[PDB]
């Protein structure tokens, strides 16, 4: 009859994910361009905006984007974000560009079959499949928070920045890295993470708009209520705090999403002071 296949997802999505190369000028002694790193990217819209991973393009002298159709472009770095490890490139194209399928009203579910699209080891575009293993993720050992999607679709070096799509070829996430664990004793099999497309999309528009993601650094680090890890700053310059609770911030039950999104430079009423939000370091 007809073979079981996710080819339909491949035909619709794959043309839009690119091979990203990071080339440096001080990599060899002859200062000729040489790949220092490589990964994948996803063309988001026809203006040439492409999402990828920050660690893939970090400190590059030239970023090369290669499409499955054979065209190659030099890419401009419009902005990146350490917190999510997302970067946004821009190629200047004419004649049209293939763009990733997006369904802004689709909610990813644990168990949804997904396909990872990328260039593992520079073997060329390869597709792997698994499912969405988890959502709202990444260790209980954070620093700066941004939650992921977890999948068992085989992810390898080179897959970074690439696409994780469902069976309809809809963009579910941006693959970021395969849990290669913290040490030794065994190699984790099937544990990979991706930035949910909703988050990836918002962050991209912010980098496109402001060239960087402006957040909300009020000045109250901890380890709700004022905690105990580190000392405060401009956040106490309006609300005395060293060990006190906090009811609701900005007229809503109290959460740093709004904090970071409140727009630095606006006096905010915090129940249990009139502090004015500031921009992250």
């Amino acid at each position: 009859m007809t073979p079981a296949s996710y080819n339909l997802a491949v035909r619709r999505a794959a043309p839009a994910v690119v091979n990203v190369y990071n080339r440096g000028l001080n990599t060899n002694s002859h200062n000729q361009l040489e790949i220092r790193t490589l990964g994948s990217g996803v063309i988001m819209d026809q203006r040439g905006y492409i999402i990828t991973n920050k660690h893939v393009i970090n400190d590059a002298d030239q970023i090369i984007v290669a499409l499955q159709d054979g065209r190659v472009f030099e890419a401009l770095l419009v902005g990146s974000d350490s917190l999510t490890d997302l970067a946004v490139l821009k190629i200047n194209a004419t004649g049209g560009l293939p763009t990733i399928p997006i369904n802004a009203r689709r909610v990813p579910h644990i168990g949804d079959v997904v396909l990872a699209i990328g260039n593992p080891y520079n073997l060329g575009q390869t597709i792997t499949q698994g499912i969405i293993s988890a959502t709202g993720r990444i260790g209980l050992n954070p620093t700066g928070r941004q939650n992921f999607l977890q999948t068992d679709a085989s992810i390898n070096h080179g897959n970074s920045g690439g696409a994780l799509v469902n069976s309809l070829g809809e963009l579910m996430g941006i693959n970021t890295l395969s849990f290669d664990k913290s040490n030794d004793g065994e190699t984790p099999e099937g544990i990979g993470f991706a930035i949910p497309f909703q988050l990836a999309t918002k962050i991209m528009d912010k980098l496109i708009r402001d060239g960087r993601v402006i957040r909300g650094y009020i000045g109250i680090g901890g380890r709700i209520v004022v905690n105990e890890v580190s000392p405060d700053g401009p956040a106490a310059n309006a609300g005395i705090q060293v060990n006190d609770l906090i009811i609701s911030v900005d007229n809503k039950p109290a959460t740093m999403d709004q904090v970071a999104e409140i727009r630095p430079g606006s006096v905010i009423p915090v129940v249990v002071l009139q502090v004015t939000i500031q921009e992250y370091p």
Binding site: R145, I218, I220, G221, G222, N227, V229, S230, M256
Partner: peptide, 4 residues
């Protein structure tokens, strides 16, 4: 842990 956290830092606002």
């Amino acid at each position: 842990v956290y830092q606002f």
